[PDB]
C-alpha cells in the first residue's frame, strides 16, 4: 500500500527524497557499534522488528492530538518518512541485508 | 489608417506634422515637386506606394 | 495561428467591368467555368475585383485548401463579399473577390488590409509559433508504470508554443487536458485556480533555481509560494 | 461544422455530469461515462438543423442526500444570453419548484442578465458557465489538487481543533475556477488534499470569499 | 570631436613607408625629420571611426605578402603596431594577450592605485 | 502582375487618383485638385507582394566593385565580358531570410555585370 | 574544424544548405558553425586534459576541487575558444565586418571571434579584442545584475519577514493568518533533513 502511495506521490520514478534521519547510515552505525557479523545468523525476531517499527512510528509525532483531525494530520505529516522507515526497517531487510541483533 | 503615414516632429511644435505639409510650407505645393525632392528614381514603385499615404493624408 | 497573409503570395486590385472578359488572361478559364451557371446575384456585382495569389508551399505546409479559405471569407463577411476560386490543380493558387451590393476601391483596399491580418484561416489566436519534438529528458517524457511494476519513460511527441491560450488548447481533440500546462502563472490562475497556480508557481520557481544545477530546500519555495497564494489571489511580491 | 458541434455538446455534457457528481448529485454511471456514439444515438448528430437542439440537452439531477434538492442545467440557444431568457428559466424553475441551476452559455451573457443572476440569489442559486470552460474538466488537471467541500460541522471541528477564526485560514475566491466547479459560496471552507514531496500528503483549508 | 588614429597607407600591395623614411626617422634629432614630415610625405594617414568602415587594414606588413590563398590582396592601410589598441594603463601589462581580459581590466584599474613617484617635483 | 506607379496630372502636377466611369464602365485616373482625367492603360490599381519576391540584382550597382573591403574571386568569370576577377557579397538586406546567397559583380571597368550562382 | 566551417560556409553560399525546423537559414547556419567550433573546443580540451601528467599542478587543483575547472585547463593549454556577445558570435559592428581587418561578409571562425590560441600561446590582436569584448560582457553582467537581484532580495524579505513558526507548530504571519499548518508541510527544520532513497519506489 505504501508502494502505491509513493507511486501516486512521485509519478516520475525519482526515489531521491529529503527526510530527517538517514536510516541506512544509522543502520551502518548500529552494525559497527555492536560489531554485527553479516555472515552469522541473527538473534533478532522479525516480529520484534514489526512491533518496534510500529511503536517507533507511534512515537514520531508532528501533530499532537487524539482527535480524528489531529490523527489524519499526523498521518500526513510523517507519511513519507513512515513509508521510508517501514521499507528500510523491514523484517526481511533486517534479516538478510542488515542482520542486526 | 490604410497605409503607413510619414510624420515630422519639428522643434517648438508639440504635435506631429505630415511631411507633405512641411514641404508645402517651404513652397513646394505640387506633389510632383515633393516626390522629385524625396524620390530620386521614378522607376521604383515601392518607394512610391510607401510615400503615397502621406500624400493622401495631405490633399 | 495562420492568417491569410502567412499563406498569401501577393494581392492586387483590378478594375474588371465584366467578369466574362477578365483583365488577366490566365484567369479566363475558371472564371467562365464558374460563370456559365448563375451561382450568385450577377446584378449585385461591382467592377472592382480583388485577386489574391496564394503559394503552394504555405498551402501544403498547413494542409489548407481554397475551399476552407473561401468558406472562412464568406463566413466572416457573409454574402456581402463574393469570393470565387479554381481547383487545387493549377500552377498558381489564385482566388478572386468582389463586393456585393467611401468608394468601392478604397473599401476593397481596406478589407484587403484587414483580411490579411485578422482573418484566422486555421489555429488559435495569440499562439504565434509551435514546435513539436521528442523530449530526451525524462522530465517531459511520459512516465508510465508497466504491467510488471517498473517505471518506463515513453518517448512521445510534445508541442511547445510561443504564445499561450491554455483555455483553448486544453479543449482540443487529441490534446492531453491533464498534463498540458503553461509557464504563464496568471493564465494558470485564471483557468485552473489558486491551488493550481500555487503548484505551477512552485514548479516554475524550482525550474529557475535548479536550472544552474543548484538546489534549495523545498520548504523555502513552499513558504514563498504560500505567501503569494494564501489570500486566494496572486499576491505579487511588490 | 456539425460533427465538431455534436462533439462539443457531448464533451460539455460529460463535464457537466462529472461536475454534478462531484457536487454530490445523483448521476448514474451510464451517463457519467457516455461514449460519443451513445450521445449521438440518444440526442443525434445534426445539432445545426435541430437534432439535437440545445433545449433537449437540459439536465435535471437530484442530490443524493435530499431527493427534493434538485438542480437544472440549461443550454441556451442564443450565443449572448439576455435578461429575458434568464426570466424564462427562472419562471420554469418556479413552476417545477427547483432552486438551483447552471446556465451553459456559448458566447457570453449580458450585463443585465448577470446583475439579475446576482440580485435574486436568496431565492434561486443559478450559476453561469461558458461552454468553452466546460469542454474540459479542470479538476482532472495535474496541477489541480483534490478539493472537498467541508460541512459546517467539519468546519466547526477544524476551527475548534486549530483554535482559529475563519479570517485566519487561507482564502479562495468565490469566482475561482474550482470554487465555481464545486459551486461553493462565501463562508464555506474547502479542504484541499495535495501530495507533498516532504510529508507525503498535505491537507490545507481555504475559506471561500 | 572625431576620434581617429594614424595608419600606414598601402600601395598596390606594398607599404608607402620605405626604408628611407626609417633612415630619416633614426636621425630625428639631427635633421629635424619628424612625424609631421612622415604625414606630409603621404606615408601615414589619420583615419576616423567612420572612414575605417571603408578601409581594408593589414594587421602587419606580413599580411601584404602574397599567400598560397590570398585573403584580401587589396589592402589600403596597415597598423603601425596592434599593441597601440591599448591605453596608458593597459600598456603597462606585460603579455596582456596571455591573460583573461577581466584581469587586464583589473590591472588597468589597479595601476592607478599603485605607489611610485607620481611626479618629480613632489618636494614642492 | 508587377507594381503600379503613381501618375500625376498634366495641369497641377498632383497625383492622379483612381476613379470609375459608370457611363462607359471604364477606369479613369482623375485629379482631385484640378479637373483633369485620363484613360488608364494598366487596369490594375494596387499590388501587394506579400512574398516579397524581389530580384536583388536590381538593387546592386556596379560601382560596388570598387570597394576594397569586398572579397574578390577568380573562380566565377563574367558571362558578359569574360573578366576573371569578380567581387562577391551577401544580400545583407532585411526581409530576406535566405540571405546567405552570394551575388557577384564583374570588376572590369564599364562592364559592371552582376549575377548570382 | 576551420575546414569544416569553410565547408558549411561554401554550402550556404551555394544555397546547398536547407533550414531545419524551427529556425531560419541564418540561424541554422549559425547553429552548424557553433556546433563545429564547440566540438573543436571540446576535442582540443580533451586532448589537453589527457596530455596532463599526475604531477601537473593545474590537474592537482582541479582534481581536488580547490580551484579551477577542466575548461580553464583547456583554455590555458589548448584553445580559448569562441567569444560570444549576448549569446551570439562577435557582431558585425562595422558594415558587414567585425573589424576593419576582415573582408565583408566573412562568417569564418576567426572573423567572428574564435580564439584558436591558448593563453600560453597568446592571443592575436583580433582575438585579443574579441576576448576583451566577451569579458566586458561578463563585467557588465556582474555590475548590472546586482541592483536587480538586491531589489528582489529586499522585496522578498519585506514580503515574508514576519512569517514565523508558532508554538502550536503552525506557520503564521503578523496578522496571525495561517500560511502553513506545519512548516514545510512536515513541521521539520531544514538543517537536519538530508537526501535518501525510497527503496520501494523504482
Ligand atoms: Zn490635376
Ligand atoms: Zn563583366
D102 closest CA partner among D86, D119, D122: D86
Burial class (CB in 10 A: 0-12, 13-18, 19+), F10: exposed
Distance of CA D37 to the CA centre of its chain: 24
Omega of the bond leading into D52 within 30 degrees of 0 (cis): yes
Q: Are C94 and C52 in contact (CB under 8 A)?
A: yes
Is the pair C, E in contact (3+ CB pairs within 8 Å)?
no
Interface contact flag, G181 D203, Cβ < 8 Å: yes
DSSP D200: E
D144 closest CA partner among D185, D167, D172, D104: D172
CA D50 to each of CA A26, C98, D42, D58, E4: distance values in angstroms, whole numbers, following the listed order: 73, 33, 14, 14, 82
A7 closest CA partner among C155, C146, G196, C181: C146
DSSP C44: G
The count of other CB atoms within 10 Å of the CB of residue C234 is: 16
Same domain assignment for residues D18 and D30: yes
Residue of C nearest to F18 (CA): C105
Residue bearing cell 500528503: D201
In angstroms, the CA E46 to CA C104 distance is: 63
All cell numbers assigned to D190: 474547502
Burial class (CB in 10 A: 0-12, 13-18, 19+), F69: buried
User: Cβ neighbours of residue A93 under 8 Å, at least 6 residues apart?
Assistant: A87, G199
In angstroms, the CA C198 to CA F56 distance is: 54
C165 closest CA partner among C142, C188, C141, C197: C188
CA C231 to each of CA D188, D189, E123, G157, G172: distance values in angstroms, whole numbers, following the listed order: 15, 13, 72, 18, 13
Mapping DSSP to helix (H, G, I), strand (E, B) and coil, where does residue E123 land? coil
Residue bearing cell 495569389: C53
For C98, phi then psi, to 5°, come to -145, 160
For G118, phi then psi, to 5°, come to -95, 170
Question: Residue D102 forms beta bridges with which residues?
Answer: D73, D127
Interface contact flag, G104 F100, Cβ < 8 Å: no
* Chains in touch with B (≥3 Cβ pairs < 8 A): C, F
User: Cβ neighbours of residue G140 under 8 Å, at least 6 residues apart?
Assistant: none
Calculate ∠ Cα D110-D113-D118, nearest 5°: 130
Interface contact flag, C23 F48, Cβ < 8 Å: no
Task: Convert G47-61 to b/e letters by CB count within 10 Å (16 or more is b).
Answer: ebbeebeeeeebbee
Domain range for D188 is 137-209
In angstroms, the CA D149 to CA D25 distance is: 14
Mapping DSSP to helix (H, G, I), strand (E, B) and coil, where does residue D26 land? coil
Calculate ∠ Cα C192-C194-C198, nearest 5°: 100
In angstroms, the CA F90 to CA G112 distance is: 16
Residue bearing cell 542486526: A100
Q: What is the DSSP secondary-structure string of G132-188? A: HHHHHHHHHHHHHHHHHHHHHHHHHHHHHTT-EE-TTS-EE-TT--EEESSGGGTT-
C106 and B CB contact within 8 Å = yes
All cell numbers assigned to F104: 557577384
All cell numbers assigned to E117: 613617484
Question: Residue C3 forms beta bridges with which residues?
Answer: C120
Residues preceding gaps in chain A (C to N > 2.5 Å) = none
Beta strands (DSSP E) in chain G are 81-82, 114-115, 164-165, 171-172, 178-180, 194-197
- Over chain A, what HEC string results? CHHHHHHHHCCCCCCEEEECCCHHHHHHHHHHHCCCCCCCCCCCCHHHHHHHHHHHHHHCCCCCCCCHHHHHHHHHHCHHHHHHHHHHCCCCHHHHCCCCC
Residue of A nearest to C150 (CA): A13
H helices then E strands: how many in chain G?
5, 6
Same domain assignment for residues D69 and D52: yes
CA D180 to each of CA C201, D89, D150, F114: distance values in angstroms, whole numbers, following the listed order: 22, 20, 15, 69
Q: How far is the CA of B44 from the centre of ligand 2 (A)?
A: 25
All cell numbers assigned to E11: 600601395
F58 and C CB contact within 8 Å = no
User: Cβ neighbours of residue G49 under 8 Å, at least 6 residues apart?
Assistant: G70, G73, G74
All cell numbers assigned to D163: 483554535
CA distance F4 to chain C (A): 10
* Greatest extent of chain F over all pairs of C-alpha atoms, in Å: 64
**F:G CB pairs within 8 Å:** 38
Same domain assignment for residues D56 and D77: yes
G182 closest CA partner among G197, G196, G168, G162: G168
Same domain assignment for residues D156 and D89: no
The count of other CB atoms within 10 Å of the CB of residue C181 is: 20
Interface contact flag, A17 G181, Cβ < 8 Å: no
Same domain assignment for residues D146 and D72: no
Number of C-alpha atoms within 13 angstroms, CB side, residue C23?
21
Same domain assignment for residues D111 and D23: yes
Interface contact flag, A76 D202, Cβ < 8 Å: yes
Same domain assignment for residues D101 and D169: no
Burial class (CB in 10 A: 0-12, 13-18, 19+), D186: exposed
Q: Are G3 and G31 in contact (CB under 8 A)?
A: no
Task: Say yes or no: domain C1-131 is CATH 3.10.350.10.
Answer: no
Inter-residue long-range contacts of C70-76, CB under 8 Å, 24+ positions, other chains counted: C70/C95, C72/C119, C72/C120, C72/C121, C73/C97, C73/C115, C73/C119, C76/C115, C76/C119
Q: Are C82 and C47 in contact (CB under 8 A)?
A: no
CA G124 to each of CA C64, G81, G110, G117, G130: distance values in angstroms, whole numbers, following the listed order: 55, 13, 10, 8, 10
Specify the number of domains making up chain D. Answer: 2
DSSP F84: S
User: Cβ neighbours of residue C31 under 8 Å, at least 6 residues apart?
Assistant: C19, C20, C22, C84, C96
Is the pair A, E in contact (3+ CB pairs within 8 Å)?
no
The count of other CB atoms within 10 Å of the CB of residue D64 is: 13
User: Cβ neighbours of residue A48 under 8 Å, at least 6 residues apart?
Assistant: none
Nearest CB among C9, C14, C15 relative to F51 is that of C9
In angstroms, the CA G12 to CA G32 distance is: 11
F94 and B CB contact within 8 Å = no
Distance of CA E9 to the CA centre of its chain: 13
All cell numbers assigned to E73: 590582396
All cell numbers assigned to F43: 487596369
Interface contact flag, F13 B32, Cβ < 8 Å: yes
Length of chain F: 117
A76 closest CA partner among G192, B37, G187, E118: G187
For E105, phi then psi, to 5°, come to -65, -40
B36 closest CA partner among A39, D22, F14, G18: F14
Distance of CA C220 to the CA centre of its chain: 40
Burial class (CB in 10 A: 0-12, 13-18, 19+), D151: exposed
Q: Are G62 and G69 in contact (CB under 8 A)?
A: yes
Interface contact flag, D209 C191, Cβ < 8 Å: no
Q: How far is the CA of F7 from the centre of ligand 1 (A)?
A: 10
Interface contact flag, G100 E57, Cβ < 8 Å: yes
A18 and C CB contact within 8 Å = yes
For A19, phi then psi, to 5°, come to -135, 165
Number of C-alpha atoms within 13 angstroms, CB side, residue G15?
10
**C:G CB pairs within 8 Å:** 43
Residues of A with CB under 8 A from a CB of D: 5, 8-10, 17-18, 65, 67, 69-70, 72-73, 75-81, 83
User: Cβ neighbours of residue F93 under 8 Å, at least 6 residues apart?
Assistant: F56, F59, F99
Nearest CB among C129, C219, C227 relative to G160 is that of C227
Q: Are F76 and G13 in contact (CB under 8 A)?
A: no
Residue bearing cell 457531448: D10
Q: Are D169 and D154 in contact (CB under 8 A)?
A: no
The count of other CB atoms within 10 Å of the CB of residue E79 is: 21
Final residue belonging to a domain, choices D99, D114, D136: D136
Distance of CA C83 to the CA centre of its chain: 22
G39 closest CA partner among G4, G87, G90, G8: G4
Q: How far is the CA of G103 from the centre of ligand 2 (A)?
A: 21
Considering just the CA atoms, what is the radius of gyration of chain D in Å?
19
Q: Are F27 and F40 in contact (CB under 8 A)?
A: yes
* Chains in touch with D (≥3 Cβ pairs < 8 A): A, C, G
CA D127 to each of CA C82, C166, D66, D180, E117: distance values in angstroms, whole numbers, following the listed order: 42, 23, 20, 8, 87
Q: Are D137 and D19 in contact (CB under 8 A)?
A: yes
User: Cβ neighbours of residue G125 under 8 Å, at least 6 residues apart?
Assistant: E59, E79, E82, E83, E85, E97
F95 and G CB contact within 8 Å = no
F27 closest CA partner among F44, F40, F8: F40
All cell numbers assigned to G139: 563585467
Residue C223 Rama label (left phi>0; alpha psi -120 to 50; beta) = alpha
Q: Which residues surround ligand 2, an ion (CB under 5 A)?
A: F 78, 80-81, 83, 106, 108, 111, 113
In angstroms, the CA B3 to CA B44 distance is: 18
Ligand nearest to the CA of F82: 2
* Alpha-carbon dihedral F83, F88, F93, F95, rounded to 10 degrees: 90
In angstroms, the CA E84 to CA E72 distance is: 23
Q: Are G170 and D170 in contact (CB under 8 A)?
A: no
Nearest CB among A18, A70, A76 relative to D201 is that of A76
All cell numbers assigned to E7: 595608419
All cell numbers assigned to E51: 572612414
Interface contact flag, D196 A75, Cβ < 8 Å: no
Ligand nearest to the CA of F83: 2
CA F14 to each of CA B48, B50, C105, C165: distance values in angstroms, whole numbers, following the listed order: 14, 17, 20, 50
Final residue belonging to a domain, choices D81, D114, D136: D136
Same domain assignment for residues D29 and D128: yes
In angstroms, the CA C234 to CA C232 distance is: 7
Ligand nearest to the CA of F107: 2
Same domain assignment for residues D83 and D30: yes
Is the pair A, D in contact (3+ CB pairs within 8 Å)?
yes
User: Cβ neighbours of residue D33 under 8 Å, at least 6 residues apart?
Assistant: none
Question: Residue D25 forms beta bridges with which residues?
Answer: D63
User: Cβ neighbours of residue E19 under 8 Å, at least 6 residues apart?
Assistant: none
Q: How far is the CA of F15 from the centre of ligand 1 (A)?
A: 7
In angstroms, the CA G128 to CA G134 distance is: 10
A76 closest CA partner among C145, D189, D192: D192
Residue F39 Rama label (left phi>0; alpha psi -120 to 50; beta) = beta
Q: Are D144 and D178 in contact (CB under 8 A)?
A: yes
Q: Are D169 and D206 in contact (CB under 8 A)?
A: yes
The count of other CB atoms within 10 Å of the CB of residue E44 is: 21
All cell numbers assigned to D79: 450565443
The count of other CB atoms within 10 Å of the CB of residue D198 is: 25
For C73, phi then psi, to 5°, come to -65, -50
In angstroms, the CA G186 to CA G172 distance is: 15
Q: Are C161 and C169 in contact (CB under 8 A)?
A: yes
Amino acid at each position: 500500500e505504501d508502494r502505491e502511495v509513493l507511486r501516486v506521490i512521485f509519478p516520475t520514478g525519482d526515489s531521491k527524497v529529503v527526510l530527517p534521519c538517514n536510516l541506512l547510515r544509522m543502520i551502518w552505525n548500529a552494525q559497527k557499534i555492536f560489531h554485527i557479523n553479516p555472515r552469522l545468523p541473527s538473534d533478532l525476531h522479525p516480529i520484534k522488528v514489526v512491533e518496534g517499527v510500529k511503536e517507533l512510528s507511534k512515537k514520531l509525532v508532528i501533530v499532537n492530538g487524539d482527535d480524528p483531525l489531529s490523527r489524519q494530520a499526523q498521518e500526513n505529516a510523517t507519511l513519507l518518512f513512515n513509508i521510508h522507515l517501514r521499507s528500510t526497517l523491514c523484517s526481511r531487510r533486517m534479516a538478510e541485508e542488515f542482520r542486526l541483533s | 489608417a490604410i497605409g503607413q503615414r510619414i510624420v515630422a516632429t519639428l522643434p517648438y511644435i508639440k504635435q506631429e506634422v505630415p511631411i507633405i505639409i512641411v514641404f508645402r510650407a517651404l513652397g513646394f505645393v505640387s506633389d510632383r515637386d515633393i516626390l522629385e525632392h524625396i524620390i530620386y528614381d521614378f522607376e521604383d514603385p515601392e518607394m512610391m506606394e510607401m510615400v503615397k499615404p502621406s500624400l493622401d493624408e495631405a490633399f | 495561428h495562420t492568417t491569410l497573409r502567412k499563406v498569401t503570395a501577393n494581392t492586387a486590385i483590378y478594375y474588371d467591368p465584366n467578369p466574362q472578359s477578365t483583365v488577366v488572361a490566365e484567369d479566363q478559364e475558371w472564371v467562365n467555368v464558374y460563370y456559365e451557371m448563375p451561382d450568385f446575384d450577377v446584378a449585385r456585382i461591382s467592377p472592382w475585383l480583388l485577386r489574391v495569389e496564394l503559394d503552394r508551399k504555405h498551402m501544403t505546409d498547413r494542409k489548407l485548401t481554397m475551399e476552407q479559405i473561401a468558406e472562412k471569407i464568406n463566413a466572416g463577411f457573409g454574402d456581402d463579399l463574393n469570393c470565387i476560386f479554381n481547383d487545387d490543380n493549377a500552377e498558381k493558387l489564385v482566388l478572386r473577390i468582389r463586393i456585393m451590393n467611401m468608394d468601392d476601391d478604397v473599401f476593397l483596399r481596406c478589407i484587403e488590409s484587414n483580411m490579411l491580418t485578422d482573418m484566422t484561416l486555421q489555429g488559435i489566436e495569440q499562439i504565434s509559433k509551435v514546435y513539436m519534438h521528442l523530449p530526451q529528458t525524462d522530465n517531459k517524457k511520459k512516465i508510465i508504470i508497466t504491467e510488471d511494476g517498473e517505471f518506463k519513460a515513453l518517448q512521445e511527441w510534445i508541442l511547445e508554443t510561443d504564445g499561450v491560450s491554455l483555455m483553448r488548447v486544453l479543449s482540443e481533440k487529441d490534446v492531453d487536458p491533464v498534463r498540458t500546462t503553461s509557464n504563464d502563472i496568471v493564465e494558470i490562475f485564471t483557468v485552473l485556480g489558486i491551488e493550481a497556480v500555487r503548484k505551477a508557481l512552485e514548479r516554475e520557481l524550482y525550474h529557475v533555481i535548479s536550472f544552474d544545477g543548484s538546489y534549495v530546500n523545498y520548504r523555502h519555495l513552499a513558504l514563498l509560494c504560500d505567501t503569494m497564494t494564501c489570500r486566494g489571489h496572486l499576491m505579487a511580491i511588490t | 461544422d456539425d460533427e465538431e458541434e455534436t462533439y462539443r455538446l457531448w464533451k460539455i455534457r460529460k463535464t457537466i455530469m462529472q461536475l454534478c457528481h462531484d457536487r454530490g448529485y445523483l448521476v448514474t454511471q451510464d451517463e457519467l461515462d457516455q461514449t460519443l456514439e451513445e450521445f449521438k444515438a440518444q440526442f443525434g448528430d445534426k445539432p445545426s438543423e435541430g437534432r439535437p437542439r440545445r433545449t433537449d440537452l437540459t439536465v435535471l439531477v437530484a442530490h443524493n442526500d435530499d431527493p427534493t434538492d434538485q438542480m437544472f442545467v440549461f443550454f441556451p440557444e442564443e450565443p449572448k444570453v439576455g435578461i429575458k431568457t434568464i426570466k424564462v428559466y427562472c419562471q420554469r424553475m418556479q413552476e417545477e419548484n427547483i432552486t438551483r441551476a447552471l446556465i451553459v452559455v456559448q458566447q457570453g451573457m449580458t450585463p443585465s442578465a448577470k446583475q439579475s443572476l446576482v440580485d435574486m440569489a436568496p431565492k434561486y442559486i443559478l450559476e453561469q458557465f461558458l461552454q468553452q470552460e466546460l469542454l474540459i474538466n479542470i479538476t482532472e488537471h495535474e496541477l489541480v489538487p483534490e478539493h472537498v467541500v467541508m460541512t459546517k460541522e467539519e468546519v466547526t471541528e477544524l476551527l475548534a481543533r486549530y483554535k482559529l477564526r475563519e479570517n485566519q485560514l487561507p482564502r479562495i475566491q468565490a469566482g475561482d475556477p474550482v470554487a465555481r466547479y464545486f459551486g461553493i459560496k462565501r463562508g464555506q471552507v474547502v479542504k484541499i488534499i495535495r501530495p507533498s514531496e516532504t510529508a507525503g500528503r498535505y491537507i490545507t483549508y481555504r475559506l471561500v470569499q | 570631436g572625431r576620434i581617429c588614429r594614424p595608419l600606414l597607407i598601402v600601395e598596390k600591395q606594398k607599404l608607402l613607408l620605405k626604408k628611407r623614411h626609417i633612415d630619416q626617422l633614426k636621425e630625428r634629432e639631427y635633421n629635424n625629420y619628424s612625424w609631421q614630415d612622415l604625414v606630409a610625405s603621404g606615408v601615414v594617414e589619420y583615419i576616423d571611426t567612420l572612414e575605417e568602415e571603408t578601409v581594408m587594414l593589414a594587421m602587419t606588413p606580413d599580411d601584404l605578402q602574397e599567400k598560397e590563398v590570398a585573403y584580401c590582396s587589396t589592402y589600403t592601410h596597415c597598423e603601425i603596431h596592434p599593441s597601440m589598441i591599448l591605453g596608458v594603463c593597459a600598456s603597462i601589462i606585460p603579455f596582456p594577450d596571455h591573460n583573461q581580459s577581466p584581469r587586464n581590466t583589473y590591472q588597468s584599474a589597479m595601476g592607478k592605485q599603485a605607489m611610485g613617484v607620481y611626479i618629480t617635483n613632489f618636494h614642492v | 502582375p508587377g507594381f503600379v506607379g503613381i501618375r500625376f496630372c498634366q495641369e497641377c502636377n498632383n497625383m492622379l487618383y483612381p476613379k470609375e466611369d459608370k457611363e462607359n464602365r471604364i477606369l479613369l485616373y482623375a485629379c482631385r485638385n484640378c479637373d483633369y482625367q485620363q484613360e488608364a492603360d494598366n487596369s490594375c490599381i494596387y499590388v501587394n507582394k506579400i512574398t516579397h519576391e524581389v530580384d536583388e540584382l536590381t538593387q546592386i550597382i556596379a560601382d560596388v566593385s570598387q570597394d576594397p573591403t569586398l572579397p574578390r574571386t577568380e573562380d566565377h568569370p563574367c558571362q558578359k565580358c569574360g573578366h576573371k576577377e569578380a567581387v562577391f557579397f551577401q544580400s545583407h538586406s532585411a526581409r530576406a531570410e535566405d540571405a546567405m546567397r552570394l551575388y557577384y559583380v564583374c570588376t572590369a571597368p564599364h562592364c559592371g555585370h552582376r549575377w548570382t550562382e | 574544424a576551420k575546414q569544416d566551417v569553410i565547408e558549411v560556409i561554401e554550402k550556404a553560399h551555394n544555397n546547398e544548405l536547407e533550414p531545419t525546423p524551427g529556425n531560419t537559414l541564418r540561424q541554422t547556419f549559425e547553429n552548424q558553425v557553433n556546433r563545429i567550433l564547440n566540438d573543436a573546443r571540446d576535442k582540443t580540451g580533451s586532448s589537453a586534459q589527457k596530455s596532463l601528467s599526475e604531477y601537473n599542478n593545474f590537474k592537482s587543483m582541479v582534481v581536488s576541487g580547490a580551484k579551477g575547472s577542466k575548461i580553464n585547463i583547456s583554455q590555458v593549454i589548448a584553445v580559448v575558444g569562441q567569444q560570444n556577445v549576448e549569446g551570439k558570435r562577435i557582431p558585425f559592428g562595422f558594415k558587414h565586418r567585425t573589424l576593419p581587418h576582415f573582408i565583408k561578409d566573412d562568417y569564418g571562425p576567426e572573423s567572428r571571434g574564435f580564439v584558436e590560441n591558448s593563453y600560453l600561446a597568446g592571443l592575436t590582436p583580433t582575438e585579443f579584442f574579441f576576448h576583451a569584448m566577451g569579458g566586458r560582457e561578463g563585467l557588465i553582467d556582474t555590475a548590472v545584475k546586482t541592483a536587480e537581484t538586491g531589489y528582489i532580495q529586499r522585496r522578498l524579505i519585506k514580503s515574508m519577514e514576519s512569517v514565523m513558526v508558532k508554538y502550536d507548530a503552525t506557520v503564521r504571519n503578523s496578522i496571525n493568518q495561517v500560511v502553513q499548518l506545519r512548516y514545510g508541510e512536515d513541521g521539520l527544520a531544514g538543517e537536519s533533513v538530508e537526501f535518501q532513497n525510497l527503496a520501494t519506489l523504482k
